[PDB]
Write an enzyme that holds these catalytic residues in place. Structure first.
Site, mmCIF file in Angstrom:
data_model
loop_
_atom_site.group_PDB
_atom_site.id
_atom_site.type_symbol
_atom_site.label_atom_id
_atom_site.label_comp_id
_atom_site.label_asym_id
_atom_site.label_seq_id
_atom_site.Cartn_x
_atom_site.Cartn_y
_atom_site.Cartn_z
ATOM 1 N N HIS A 49 -11.981 80.597 60.078
ATOM 2 C CA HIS A 49 -11.435 79.262 59.913
ATOM 3 C C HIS A 49 -12.553 78.559 59.170
ATOM 4 O O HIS A 49 -13.710 78.671 59.554
ATOM 5 C CB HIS A 49 -11.198 78.600 61.264
ATOM 6 N N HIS A 53 -2.277 81.951 56.220
ATOM 7 C CA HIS A 53 -3.010 80.960 57.005
ATOM 8 C C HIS A 53 -4.515 81.261 57.019
ATOM 9 O O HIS A 53 -5.350 80.374 57.224
ATOM 10 C CB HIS A 53 -2.422 80.901 58.437
ATOM 11 N N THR A 81 -5.216 79.198 68.704
ATOM 12 C CA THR A 81 -5.412 77.933 68.006
ATOM 13 C C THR A 81 -4.358 77.652 66.947
ATOM 14 O O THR A 81 -4.368 76.583 66.331
ATOM 15 C CB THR A 81 -6.768 77.876 67.356
ATOM 16 N N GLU A 122 -13.509 75.309 64.535
ATOM 17 C CA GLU A 122 -12.476 74.755 65.397
ATOM 18 C C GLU A 122 -13.153 74.115 66.598
ATOM 19 O O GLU A 122 -12.912 72.954 66.914
ATOM 20 C CB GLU A 122 -11.513 75.859 65.810
ATOM 21 N N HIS A 168 -13.442 84.562 64.583
ATOM 22 C CA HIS A 168 -12.748 84.859 65.831
ATOM 23 C C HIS A 168 -12.464 86.351 65.870
ATOM 24 O O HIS A 168 -11.776 86.873 64.995
ATOM 25 C CB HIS A 168 -11.409 84.101 65.917
ATOM 26 N N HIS A 215 -10.731 87.138 62.048
ATOM 27 C CA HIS A 215 -10.427 86.231 60.965
ATOM 28 C C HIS A 215 -11.348 85.019 61.044
ATOM 29 O O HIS A 215 -12.123 84.876 61.984
ATOM 30 C CB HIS A 215 -8.985 85.792 61.075
#
Ligand SMILES: Cn1sc(=O)c2cc(S(N)(=O)=O)ccc21
Ligand SMILES: [Zn+2]
Length: 258
Positions: A94, A62, A196, A104, A117, A92
């Site tokens: 996004h 992911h 999330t 996000e 994050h 990590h």
């Protein structure tokens, strides 16, 4: 099948296996700068990453996480809207498939290229698995990334991506200093939210910083070259691993600045 960010298993489908997706304190959300309340009783943030110990970098299907040794109070977060100490366990990102999306949280509807994050868990719960069962069990520090100048501190991360291209792959990643990922200012917005991605546990105190960091186009580009799929499976680029903003509902976003 199981969750992802695809048309058939993306965020809009998550509520079927994880009913908490339509909860009361779901993240991420849109931060309305003019509607956020300045709170002078908020203490400054205290980021103590001088004894940080990175151990590994992993592609979990992911995103890619950089894990840290949380057996002791090495890299901790305290102050601000927090009570007690929080240990950094991992960080990590996004990101998007285009420079204009990936984050996000959004600021006044604005999306950034990506979002970092830095996940921490409350030490009064002994371990991570116990902290995710408490309303104040986690504290994630969120940092926005905008494309511009390259971020030197991020390159070591970027150079190791080739070796963790597909799901399940990992690699030793020691001596990484998370301090090179912090913007100059620690001004922030704080609010109660949740993880999330599934299981979407409403156990998070979100601390989103106002100041973003810049990363070169070439740096963000290499993120998009990762794969969701495992080795030997049809290639699916790891892009758009971000969840849409959720309804704030009965919540208030406080600001530590004015
Ligand atoms: C399954 N785990 S472990 C961990 O630290 C974490 C963090 C987040 S996030 N994108 O809300 O920060 C989402 C899921 C998750
Ligand atoms: Zn995240």
């Amino acid at each position: 099948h199981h969750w992802g960010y695809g048309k058939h298993n993306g965020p809009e489908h998550w509520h079927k296996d994880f009913p908490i997706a339509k909860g009361e304190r779901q993240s991420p959300v849109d931060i309305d700068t003019h509607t956020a309340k300045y709170d002078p009783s908020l203490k400054p943030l205290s980021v103590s990453y001088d004894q940080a110990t990175s151990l590994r970098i992993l592609n979990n299907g992911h995103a890619f996480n950089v894990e840290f040794d949380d057996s002791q109070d090495k890299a901790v977060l305290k102050g601000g809207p927090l009570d007690g100490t929080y240990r950094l366990i991992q960080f990590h990102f996004h990101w998007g498939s285009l420079d204009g999306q990936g984050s996000e949280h959004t600021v006044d509807k604005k999306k950034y290229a990506a979002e970092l994050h830095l996940v921490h868990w409350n030490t009064k719960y002994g371990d991570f698995g116990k902290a995710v069962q408490q309303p104040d069990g986690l504290a994630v520090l969120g940092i926005f990334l905008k494309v511009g100048s390259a971020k030197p501190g991020l390159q070591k991360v970027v150079d190791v991506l080739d070796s963790i291209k597909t799901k399940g792959k990992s690699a030793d990643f020691t001596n990484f200093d998370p301090r090179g990922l912090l913007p100059e200012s620690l001004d922030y917005w704080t609010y109660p939210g949740s993880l999330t991605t599934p299981p979407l546990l409403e156990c998070v105190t979100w601390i989103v910083l106002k100041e973003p960091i810049s990363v070169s186009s070439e740096q963000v580009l290499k993120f998009r070259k990762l794969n969701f799929n495992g080795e030997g499976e049809p290639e699916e680029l790891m892009v758009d691993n971000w969840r849409p903003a959720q309804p704030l509902k009965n919540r208030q976003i406080k600001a530590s600045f004015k």
